[PDB]
């Protein structure tokens, strides 16, 4: 049961990278909403770890305004390539991250569960919705954001249409 004490040992590191690439405001809400959803229960802080990672991935595509089943990634061109472009212009991610999941679906599933470890290298030397929730997702799109960028955020903010709003406007830029 590491999620108890351990989660604090790893999390602290997960925030160091996220909190640094994440908007203070959002980080203030995510913990506020996610705190009111589950409450004080440990499940809340537990979902914050997973929601934090999946969020980092987006921070890449959107554009970083700042500055192991994945370790083998180095054996892939997309890494050395996407990393050569992404680091130069994360704006080329949306199109890349797509070609990555279309070619290597096994890795795409990992890179998502290993953002930090996936970023450090990328920053250093080498659905489930319905007609009731949907209307809530696209609601953020009209804000001037891709249709997919919403499906992710919405689910990234715990389906919190109130949170995503800030997550979209606080996603850099
Ligand atoms: Zn950043």
Swiss-Prot record:
Residues 132-173 are annotated as: HIV-1 vpr binding. Belongs to the RAD23 family. Residues 131-171 form the UBA domain. It comes from the Eukaryota. It is found in: Nucleus. Multiubiquitin chain receptor involved in modulation of proteasomal degradation. Binds to 'Lys-48'-linked polyubiquitin chains in a length-dependent manner and with a lower affinity to 'Lys-63'-linked polyubiquitin chains. Proposed to be capable to bind simultaneously to the 26S proteasome and to polyubiquitinated substrates and to deliver ubiquitinated proteins to the proteasome. Involved in nucleotide excision repair and is thought to be functional equivalent for RAD23B in global genome nucleotide excision repair (GG-NER) by association with XPC. In vitro, the XPC:RAD23A dimer has NER activity. Can stabilize XPC. This is UV excision repair protein RAD23 homolog A. The modification Phosphoserine is found at residue 170. The ubiquitin-like domain mediates interaction with ATXN3. Interacts with XPC; the interaction is suggesting the existence of a functional equivalent variant XPC complex. Interacts with PSMD4 and PSMC5. Interacts with ATXN3. Interacts with UBQLN2. The lineage of its organism: Eukaryota, Metazoa, Chordata, Craniata, Vertebrata. Changing residue 146 to E: Abolishes interaction with HIV-1 vpr. The chain holds residues 230 to 360 of 363 of the full protein.
């Amino acid at each position: 049961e590491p999620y108890n004490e351990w989660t604090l040992e790893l999390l602290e590191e997960l925030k160091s990278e996220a909190v640094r690439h994440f908007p203070r405001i959002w980080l203030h809400n995510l913990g506020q909403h996610i705190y009111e959803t589950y409450g004080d229960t440990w499940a809340g802080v537990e979902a914050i770890i997973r929601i934090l990672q999946q969020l980092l991935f987006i921070h890449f595509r959107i554009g970083c305004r700042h500055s192991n089943p994945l370790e083998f990634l180095r054996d892939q061109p997309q890494f050395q390539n996407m990393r050569q472009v992404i680091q130069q212009n994360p704006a080329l991610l949306p199109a890349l991250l797509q070609q990555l999941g279309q070619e290597n679906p096994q890795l795409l599933q990992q890179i998502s569960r290993h953002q930090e470890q996936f970023i450090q290298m990328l920053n250093e030397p080498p659905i489930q919705v319905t007609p009731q929730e949907k209307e809530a997702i696209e609601r953020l799109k009209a804000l001037g954001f891709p249709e997919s960028l919403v499906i992710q955020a919405y689910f990234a903010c715990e389906k919190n249409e109130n949170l995503a709003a800030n997550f979209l406007l606080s996603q850099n830029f």
